[PDB]
Structure formats: C-alpha cells, structure tokens
Amino acid sequence: PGLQIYPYEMLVVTNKGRTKLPPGVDRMRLERHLSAEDFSRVFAMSPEEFGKLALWKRNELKKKAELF
DSSP: OOOOOBOTGGGOSSTTOSSOOOTTOOGGGHHHHBOHHHHHHHTSSOHHHHHHSOHHHHHHHHHHTTOO
C-alpha cells in the first residue's frame, strides 16, 4: 500500500536531472517518495508534517530540498 520509496538524489527534480525518476515517481509527490531517512534528512520534518505545513512552507521545502 502507498507509493514506492527511493533514494533522495534519485528522486530529485532539477538539481539531479528532470523527470529521470525511478519506477513510479513524479514531481507531484516527490517529497512523499522519499524514505523516513531521506525526507527527515532533506526536509528535517515528518512526511505528515509537510501535508500539515503551509503552501509557502511546502513550496520552500521542495524548493530547498532540491525537489520543487
């Protein structure tokens, strides 16, 4: 159940490529395809936190996490 989890650099948006995402990954929810390690490492917040954050926050995160 859910989505497939992959490394961070592999799930990056522009910094490490464009749409070269692993099997089953899209910019729509790239910040959700990262594992607990990857997410808490690139964002420093819980996967649930992001959804409960803000539009400027979620943006800035995906924007600072190299995946916006």
